[PDB]
Chains A and B, each alone.
Chain A
């Protein structure tokens, strides 16, 4: 995020980090329950990647984070890689996340929910802060 700010640690409990076996963060995701993570289809997640929950500072060695293995990748069959439409993939954890103060689920809306133009929302992540 360019021009964002540091979050209050643990305040966005559903935020997870997708890391490859190298330990490199390549994408974010959101826990919707203890066994499923929603992420973007273009992230190209494989079962060799790891879901990291309860993390704030990727440089700290003393945070009690949960490194969860992925059992299966569910790429929306309607995802069009040429237009990046329907960019969503579900990840089923081989090991269920343990919910706590710093790890929990975000809510999903109803297909008929309305989010009006002008509404202020929040986006989170560990992406580049300057390009």
Chain B
């Protein structure tokens, strides 16, 4: 859980 395949960018 909590480790998206598409990394978020902020």
Chain A interface residues toward B at CB < 8 A: 7-13, 32, 100-102, 104-108, 122
Residue of A nearest to B6 (CB): A10
Q: Name the distance in Å between B9's Cβ and chain A's nearest Cβ.
A: 5
Alpha-carbon separation in the docked complex, A11 to B6 (Å): 5
B interface residue numbers (CB < 8 A to A): 1-2, 4-10
Question: B6 touches which one: A9, A32, A106 (CB < 8 A)?
Answer: A9
Partner of A101, one of B2, B5, B8, B10: B5
Contact check, A106 vs B1: say whether CB atoms are below 8 A apart.
yes
Whether the Cβ atoms of B1 and A104 lie closer than 8 Å is yes
| The one of B1, B6, B9, B10 that contacts A107, using a Cβ cutoff of 8 Å | B1
CA distance A13 to B6 in the complex (A): 8
A to B CB contacts below 8 Å, 17 in the list = A8-B7, A10-B4, A10-B6, A11-B4, A11-B6, A11-B7, A11-B8, A11-B9, A12-B8, A13-B4, A13-B6, A100-B5, A104-B1, A105-B1, A106-B1, A107-B2, A122-B8
